[PDB]
Amino acid sequence: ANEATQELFQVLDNTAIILQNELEISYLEAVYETGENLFQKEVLQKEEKQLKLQASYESIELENFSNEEIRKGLQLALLKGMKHGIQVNHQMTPDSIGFIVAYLLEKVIQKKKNVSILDPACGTANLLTTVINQLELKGDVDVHASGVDVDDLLISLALVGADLQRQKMTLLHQDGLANLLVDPVDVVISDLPVGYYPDDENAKTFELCREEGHSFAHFLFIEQGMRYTKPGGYLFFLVPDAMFGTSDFAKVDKFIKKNGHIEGIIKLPETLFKSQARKSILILEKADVDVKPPKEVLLANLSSLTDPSVTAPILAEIENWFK
Ligand SMILES: C[S@@+](CC[C@H](N)C(=O)[O-])C[C@H]1O[C@@H](n2cnc3c(N)ncnc32)[C@H](O)[C@@H]1O
Ligand SMILES: [Cl-]
Numbered sequence: 001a002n003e004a005t006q007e008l009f010q011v012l013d014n015t016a017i018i019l020q021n022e023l024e025i026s027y028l029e030a031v032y033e034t035g036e037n038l039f040q041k042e043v044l045q046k047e048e049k050q051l052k053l054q055a056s057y058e059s060i061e062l063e064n065f066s067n068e069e070i071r072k073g074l075q076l077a078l079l080k081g082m083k084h085g086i087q088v089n090h091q092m093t094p095d096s097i098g099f100i101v102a103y104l105l106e107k108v109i110q111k112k113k114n115v116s117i118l119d120p121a122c123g124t125a126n127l128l129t130t131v132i133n134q135l136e137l138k139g140d141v142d143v144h145a146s147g148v149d150v151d152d153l154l155i156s157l158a159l160v161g162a163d164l165q166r167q168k169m170t171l172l173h174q175d176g177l178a179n180l181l182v183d184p185v186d187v188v189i190s191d192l193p194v195g196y197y198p199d200d201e202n203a204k205t206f207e208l209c210r211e212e213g214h215s216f217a218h219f220l221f222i223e224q225g226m227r228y229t230k231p232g233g234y235l236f237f238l239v240p241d242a243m244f245g246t247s248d249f250a251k252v253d254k255f256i257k258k259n260g261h262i263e264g265i266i267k268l269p270e271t272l273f274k275s276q277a278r279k280s281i282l283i284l285e286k287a288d289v290d291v292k293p294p295k296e297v298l299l300a301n302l303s304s305l306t307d308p309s310v311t312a313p314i315l316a317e318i319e320n321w322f323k
Contacts, residue, residue: 001069008065008073011038015056016077022049028081029153035074035160038062067165068133071126074161078124088276089193090154092123093238096272096305098130101189101236101281105131107322108234109186114142116185118228120176121193121221122147125158129165131189145169146185148176177217177224178202184233188225191238194218208255218243219252226259231288234263241267241280260286264298264321266314269305
């Protein structure tokens with residue numbers, strides 16, 4: 001599409017701008033509200049224009065749009081809704097990055113016909129649904145995906161996006177660092193929250209707990225993720241590249257080595273971020289009886305997404321890395 005995704009976004013935008021004004025809610029909260037209307041084929045908040053909304057919703061038939069066209073349409077609305085006032089930790093992962101994650105999963109899953117995935121801090125699930133739609137694109141791989149988020153609005157947006165994209169996935173509204181009723185997955189992916197974890201009692205259940213004060217949410221997510229990965233499975237975390245140079249990272253490094261290994265660290269282009277400090281993709285493998293670390297960790301500086309002088313030698317290496 002784009003043709004189709006713009007059509008959908010125009011319906012979402014116009015109707016959310018109405019609901020934003022009538023209900024006096026944020027554009028982002030209006031995107032959720034308009035999306036349930038569209039999905040369920042009702043104007044859900046009638047006792048609170050109604051003709052105008054209905055006409056806009058009936059102007060499209062969603063069955064005629066692909067999952068990716070529906071996702072890309074929501075992505076435009078989410079992006080609009082997160083332009084100001086949203087903290088970095090609540091920012092959705094754009095597919096400029098998600099496609100890169102989907103590509104990397106493609107290398108590790110190889111000729112598996114079933115892949116299970118967990119994002120334990122999933123937000124809007126844009127990353128997760130970008131990954132799902134890419135892997136299933138060929139018609140051979142069945143993805144079984146689970147996402148967890150603690151936030152009401154973001155998990156609601158994950159849930160309606162799943163509904164609108166016609167996904168069969170599991171989305172949990174809870175603390176992703178508490179116990180998860182999720183079976184161990186082939187792959188963990190997450191764009192990690194960075195800062196303090198406020199639940200100091202739950203933190204105690206983790207080896208990466210800090211003795212004094214709040215623990216780091218970003219460290220505990222690495223440990224939780226490894227906890228819910230199958231032996232020999234992989235983990236892909238988006239993290240600030242500055243994490244690696246802190247003295248505290250030595251502790252996470254030591255932890256990882258007791259449980260697996262680092263496969264690679266791929267720095268992402270600056271222009272993918274607002275002015276967000278530059279993130280990197282941390283690639284981990286969980287230990288097993290027939291898994292060894294690479295001879296050398298892949299360290300790649302993907303300073304451009306578009307210039308092949310930069311991308312070609314990096315992608316050529318990644319093409320063979322996991323074989
Ligand atoms: C950068 S956002 C993730 C963006 C997401 N990948 C997307 O596509 O929309 C990080 C997420 O971590 C979540 N989070 C923070 N603490 C959490 C916790 N204890 N359990 C589950 N989610 C948590 C936030 O609500 C936030 O959505
Ligand atoms: Cl479909």
